[PDB]
Ligand binder design. Structure first.
Ligand SMILES: Nc1ncnc2c1ncn2[C@@H]1O[C@H](COP(=O)(O)OP(=O)(O)O)[C@@H](O)[C@H]1O
Ligand SMILES: [Cl-]
Ligand SMILES: [Mg+2]
Length: 163
């Protein structure tokens, strides 16, 4: 089967994430975008908000299905019958954290491979963190995220919260 999963916290999805997602969807027949709740940090948006943003920004790409999962990414991948997990590599610093993750996944299921794509174009400088900071301080994020994400950030920062 030509099936792959693109996991991430996507908080929020940016044009850099979307480039990885579309490149993956161009290679594989079906691509599952999985919002992983997992984290070494507290997310700005909930899982459900992140999922809906993702659905809206990829609705015209037919071989993309956006879902969220309860368990391990490696079991979600098996459930989808996916043979590859796709991740982007922006900088040299993305190295070690990605290496541990793939080392663990390889032990849990060595029949599922982790493929890294380099962010090798004009979105390489961006990150979710840079977009959230800019947004929090009233800067423009239109060159960084889809219009739907820009609006969700305006809405999120108008609400009171741990931010
Ligand atoms: N600017 C970028 N350019 C290319 N690929 C990216 C970029 N940002 C993220 N990616 C890739 O897209 C996916 C999104 O990861 P992310 O949503 O930030 O959550 P997490 O790192 O917590 O799993 C990963 O494959 C990531 O490496
Ligand atoms: Cl294939
Ligand atoms: Mg503003």
């Amino acid at each position: 089967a030509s099936i792959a999963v693109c996991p991430g916290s996507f908080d929020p999805v940016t044009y850099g994430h979307l480039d990885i997602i579309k490149r993956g969807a161009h290679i594989f027949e079906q691509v599952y975008v999985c919002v992983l709740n997992n984290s070494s940090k507290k997310p700005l948006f909930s899982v459900e908000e992140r999922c809906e943003l993702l659905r809206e920004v990829t609705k015209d790409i037919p071989n993309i299905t956006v879902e969220t999962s309860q368990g391990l990414l490696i079991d979600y991948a098996r459930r989808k019958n996916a043979k590859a997990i796709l991740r982007g590599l922006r900088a040299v610093s993305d190295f070690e954290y990605e290496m541990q993750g793939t080392s663990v996944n390889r032990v849990l299921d060595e029949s599922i491979e982790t493929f890294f794509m380099m962010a090798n174009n004009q979105y390489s400088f961006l990150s979710s963190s840079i977009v959230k900071e800019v947004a929090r301080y009233d800067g423009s994020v239109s060159e960084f995220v889809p219009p739907e994400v820009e609006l969700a950030l305006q809405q999120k920062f108008r609400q009171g919260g741990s931010h």
